[PDB]
């Protein structure tokens, strides 16, 4: 159908590759495509260069590394719970210094996980994303002392875990202290160790008045560098022998050892720019020709004194400016764990260099392998990939965390780090962030933003030269952005000339009205201010930010539907999102389609080559939503490069399809849409709208026991033929069977634990004369509330290219699919932050309906709009009404979209279609329509004196219609807003959440019910629930909660028995967790005694613990 698009801003550049922050970062770290001799000293190469050589004699040196091919492809890794990875080899050579002997070998170091095409990892079968971290950049900072108003703290900050934080301060007594590892000593001492004389310090610092006097200490200048160095080593290491070579080694490792101190390239560049100096390397001092040489300390002190005095060109630093906060991407995070593993490996090497009589013999790879594994599994930036829908994955790869190793601790993060700083503009989305306690600490990269080689976020601007806007675009950091006057992207242009006398611009974030002459740059697009998710909200300019945040976040949670549709009002970013997230197959070059299947597409390209594309069909995502690709071409069709070959999940002809377009009425409805509840039509179920496919995975193991082996079998003791009906010969449920709660998926038997039968059992056996069998039923059954159709079984048994962990003989996995129809308690939402649970599904004859008999689909309450202030959803609905009757869709770009007049034109055309149809078919205006027009006239909505048709048209241009109540045939007494709205079904389905328990498993130590639906758990009756019962005086209810219902063992047994006998519950006794508390206090050497009123002990342990 026809797509009409609005707006006058033409985007000079498209969005960059939206996952490049992942892909390019990791490619940089591995340098796998680069011939070894051409590699830069970065990434894992730089890790190797820091570790090696390994000395002390023997020497083990690094030549080069190599990455081989992955032993298993990606799908096989998902299927067999493998890690997708490449073997790492290193060429090393051992030289004995005195012999001259040289032994060389390529040693195998383990495996390194590989990034897949879309930017994610496959760690032990599960997809994972390494989330980028934001931190304070290394460098040299100057900050107000929060105590002393006219004094300043200087802070030297290296890369994380690459040196200590050093602070310089001007003490109230006037001496300039240095703090490192929490040790306040006079800086003069270190200056002396560096080789500075009072002459050089006088001539270099005296300009700043009396400050330099607090630096002059004669007892220090009276000592040569060696005596000062030993003095520092004493006041830094109390009790350590002040050995000369040990003091040199310590201070060198603290200030000058590049293998231990590292400002990084960013900290280097910023320290140089700030202090106006040049650095040889990346450390604070060097060791040259037997002595220490200063690099940073004197320039830092120079600046600190100049700032304290007041001399111009010296300012304090804004630590939240995005020129001072940088992004650690996956490549850097991984390289750091690699560097730690390599350091442990080198310690093992030196260890074996002492004890021994080859490179391989010297190298134990295990620590390295351990560190990488530890990074990729148990890190806080290593996250289970969200692939609910394909936008979810794309968005996940662009997230930014201020938490993680080397970052902030929540519950402590103040208001400053969580703020949106002025410099976030075009760099970090200002709306998309969590609503809980993590608010402001997790964020999203802006659509046009790019992380530069140093890790600062850059945004693009177009160059303006004398009022002419060029096509030169320049990516800037926030420091560079601050130099210029930058115009807003909606500045009116005639061709390339700014066609306005007054121009809205920014100077250092500050809004300012400016002449064209003064304009230096101009924004590329409103799009650059917001995340990808926020860029998908039409009419964003009419939505309060708080609800825009919710619409942003909830697009992530949309379930892919079997009949998904793209929105009738789009922003124009839907195709690019489908493309960048690999949610579709596209033609590689021009060609012709040779074969088309549910399973595969074969295309003949211009080269004559015949390329085959297998289609992924009903695959299970990390979240159980269905990944399947559907072909969208036919045999013989001519395709150009980039044309769509197949739709993935949430894709409709290559457009992002996160839900359905439904016909909506905005009106109250009998309490059923009270407080954000939502009423829907049964029609939606009838035509499988909001139907989704979900796939669950169940797993069972058969292991060797000391009591005999577990067996996966059909021969299960005491089960009928009905219970085994759908079990295969080997005891595994067959493909296509319908399984319900209780049904067996995998039969399994286990040998019984050695037990003498209770005398009652002995007698019951004699009465029936039946030998108790030797194995018991331990089968895998469908848990409560689950089930569906069996669609796959995998069977890995030992003795078969298959080897499992020690003692397991076989693993069986069963895949079960369900088609989930929308039901009461499921969550729906729109892109403007309107969200609600379905409270009522009405039959079609109860639905409000148009005069032509068309019922609406969903009924949203008007009380949800005024206090939420998200009017974009109203405009969307108005335009949806137009589109409904014109058979068209719209692209309305954010801040550059459809305006009310154009929507009114379209509603006039749509009215002609909606009403002239009637006037032709031989009908006039209804009596009920006349009653509603009478009311509308009193409401001020229609002009008195016009004809029925003209007034109906006025209403229609306000987006309102006469609506009939399906229960009565009488009209709603005012005209109602009706139109098409895009609504998604979110991944919060009551099918997954409903859970109840009578009794069930209890905890080992506390004897309290376990938690969790999978453990058949109980609900927590926490401290505050207890307070509520206390405040009602509900003493017995509360005593039940604390005893008979939790960890009163005899109480719970006796209450179950009394109920099944129809008696009343007995009186509770002591909870077990109080017994546990008494025993744990006895272990602390405390005697805790329950007494009676006569102060005589009472034994709560019933003699069982007294000798």
């Amino acid at each position: 159908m026809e797509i009409k698009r609005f707006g006058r801003i033409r985007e000079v550049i498209p969005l960059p590759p939206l996952t490049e922050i992942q892909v390019e970062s990791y490619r940089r770290a591995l340098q796998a495509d680069v011939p070894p001799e051409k590699r830069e000293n970065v990434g894992i190469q730089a890790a190797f260069r820091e570790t090696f050589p390994i000395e002390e004699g023997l020497v083990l040196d690094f030549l080069e590394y190599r990455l081989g091919e992955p032993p298993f492809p990606q799908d096989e890794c998902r299927e067999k719970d493998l890690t997708y990875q490449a073997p790492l080899y290193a060429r090393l050579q051992l030289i004995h210094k005195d012999t001259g002997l040289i032994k060389e070998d390529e040693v195998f170091l383990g495996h390194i996980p590989l990034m897949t095409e879309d930017g994610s990892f496959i760690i032990n079968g599960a997809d994972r994303v390494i989330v980028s971290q934001i931190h304070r950049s290394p460098g040299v900072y100057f900050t107000p002392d929060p105590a002393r108003p006219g004094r300043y703290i200087a802070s030297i900050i290296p890369l994380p875990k690459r040196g200590p934080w050093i602070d310089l301060e001007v003490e109230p007594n006037g001496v300039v202290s240095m703090k490192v590892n929490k040790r306040k000593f006079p800086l003069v001492l270190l200056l002396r160790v560096l080789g500075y004389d009072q002459e050089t310090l006088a001539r270099e610092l005296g300009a700043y008045g009396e400050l330099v006097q607090g630096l002059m200490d004669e007892s220090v200048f009276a000592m040569r560098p060696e005596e000062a160095l030993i003095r520092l080593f004493t006041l830094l290491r109390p009790g350590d022998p002040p050995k000369r070579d040990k003091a040199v080694a310590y201070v060198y490792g603290l200030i000058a050892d590049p293998r231990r101190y590292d400002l990084g390239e960013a900290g280097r560049y910023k320290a140089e720019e700030k202090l106006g100096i040049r650095l040889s390397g990346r450390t604070l001092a060097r060791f040259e020709d037997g002595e220490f040489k200063d690099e940073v300390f004197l320039p830092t002190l120079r600046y600190l004194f100049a700032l304290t005095a007041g001399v111009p060109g010296h300012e304090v630093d804004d630590i939240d400016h995005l020129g001072n906060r940088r992004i650690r991407t996956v490549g850097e995070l991984m390289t750091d764990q690699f560097r730690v593993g390599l350091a442990r490996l080198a310690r093992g090497v030196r260890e074996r260099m002492l004890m021994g009589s080859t490179p391989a013999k010297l190298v134990n790879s295990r620590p390295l392998e351990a560190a990488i594994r530890e990074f990729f599994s148990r890190s806080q930036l290593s996250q289970f990939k969200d692939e609910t829908n394909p936008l979810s994955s794309l968005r996940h790869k662009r997230r930014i965390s201020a938490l993680g190793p080397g970052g902030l601790t929540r519950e402590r993060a103040g208001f400053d780090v969580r703020d949106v700083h002025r410099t976030h503009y075009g760099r970090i989305c200002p709306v998309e962030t969590p609503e809980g306690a993590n608010i402001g600490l997790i964020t999203s990269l802006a659509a046009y933003a790019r992380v530069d080689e140093l890790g600062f976020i850059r945004t693009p601007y177009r160059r303006v030269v004398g009022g002419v806007v060029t096509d030169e675009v320049v990516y800037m950091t926030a420091t560079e952005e601050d130099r210029y006057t930058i115009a807003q992207a909606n500045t009116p242009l005639e061709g390339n000339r700014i066609a306005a006398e007054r121009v809205v611009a920014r100077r250092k974030g500050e809004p300012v009205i400016v002449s064209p002459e003064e304009v230096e740059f101009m924004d590329v697009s409103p799009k650059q201010v917001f995340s990808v998710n926020t860029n998908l909200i039409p009419f964003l300019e009419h939505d309060d930010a708080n609800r825009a945040l919710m619409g942003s976040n909830m697009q992530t949670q949309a379930v892919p539907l079997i009949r998904a549709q793209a929105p009738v009002v789009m922003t124009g970013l839907e195709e690019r999102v489908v493309r960048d997230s690999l949610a579709a197959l596209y033609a590689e070059e021009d060609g012709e389609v040779a074969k088309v299947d549910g399973n595969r597409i074969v295309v003949r390209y211009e080269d004559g080559r015949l390329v085959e594309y297998p289609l992924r069909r009903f695959y299970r995502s990390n979240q159980g939503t269905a990944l399947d690709q559907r072909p969208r071409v036919v045999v013989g069709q001519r395709v150009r490069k980039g044309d769509l070959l197949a739709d993935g999940p949430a894709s409709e002809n290559g457009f992002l399809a996160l839900g359905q377009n439904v016909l909506v009425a905005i009106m109250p409805f009998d309490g059923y849409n009270f407080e954000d509840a939502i009423v829907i039509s049964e029609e939606l179920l009838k035509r499988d709208f909001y139907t989704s496919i979900h796939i669950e995975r169940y797993e069972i193991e058969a292991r060797d026991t000391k009591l005999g082996p577990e067996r996966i079998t059909r021969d299960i003791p005491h089960l009928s033929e009905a219970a085994l009906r759908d079990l295969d010969e080997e005891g595994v449920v067959r493909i296509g069977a319908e399984v319900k709660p209780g049904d067996i998926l995998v039969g399994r038997t286990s040998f019984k634990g050695e037990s003498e039968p209770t005398p009652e059992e002995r007698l019951l056996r004699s009465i029936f004369g039946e030998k108790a069998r030797d194995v018991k039923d331990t089968s895998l059954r469908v848990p409560p509330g689950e089930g569906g159709i069996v669609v796959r079984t995998v069977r890995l048994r030992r003795g078969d290219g298959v080897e499992l962990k020690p003692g397991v003989r076989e693993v069986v996995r069963v895949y079960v699919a369900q088609k989930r129809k929308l039901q009461v308690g499921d969550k729906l939402a729109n892109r403007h932050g309107n969200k609600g649970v379905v409270a009522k599904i009405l039959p079609v004859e109860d639905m409000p309906h148009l005069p032509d008999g068309t019922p609406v689909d969903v009924i949203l309450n008007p009380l949800g709009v005024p206090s939420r202030m998200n009017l974009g959803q109203i405009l969307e609905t108005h335009l949806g009404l137009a589109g409904y009757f014109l058979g068209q869709r719209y692209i309305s770009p954010i801040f550059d979209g459809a305006k009310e007049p154009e929507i009114k034109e379209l509603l006039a055309q749509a009215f002609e279609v909606y009403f002239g149809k009637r006037k032709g078919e031989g009908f006039g205006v209804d009596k009920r329509e006349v009653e509603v027009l009478r009311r509308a006239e009193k409401l001020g909505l229609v002009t008195p004196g016009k004809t029925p048709e003209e007034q109906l048209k006025e209403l229609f241009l306000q987006g309102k219609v006469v609506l009939y109540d399906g229960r009565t045939g009488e009209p709603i007494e005012g005209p109602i807003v009706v139109g098409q709205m895009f609504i998604m079904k979110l991944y919060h389905m009551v099918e997954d959440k409903m859970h109840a328990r009578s009794t069930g498993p209890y905890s080992l130590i506390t004897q309290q019910p376990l938690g969790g639906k999978a453990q058949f758990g109980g609900q927590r009756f926490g401290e505050m629930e207890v307070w509520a019962l206390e405040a009602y005086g509900a003493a017995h209810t509360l005593q039940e909660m604390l005893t008979l219902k939790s960890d009163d063992i005899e109480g719970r047994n006796a209450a179950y028995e009394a109920i099944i006998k129809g008696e009343d519950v007995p009186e509770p006794s002591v909870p077990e967790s109080f017994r546990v508390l008494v025993k744990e206090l006895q272990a602390l050497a405390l005697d805790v005694q329950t007494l009676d009123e006569k102060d005589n002990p009472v034994d709560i342990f019933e003699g069982l613990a007294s000798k």
């Binding site: 292991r703 026991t705 003692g807 080992l1004 130590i1005 744990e1080 006895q1082 050497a1085």
Partner: protein, 57 residues
Amino acid sequence: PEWMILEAVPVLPPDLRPMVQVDGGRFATSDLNDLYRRLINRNNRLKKLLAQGAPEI
């Protein structure tokens, strides 16, 4: 007052610091067992070192 110094250290009953085989036969145990084992090894080595009259250091 002297009861604030320990001579006999109490040992918690073993079901409050269990050693349990989970599904799969693999074993899980409380940290307290390792803290006790450290204490017991150090005490036993002290009793032996006293028996051999080891130097004061």
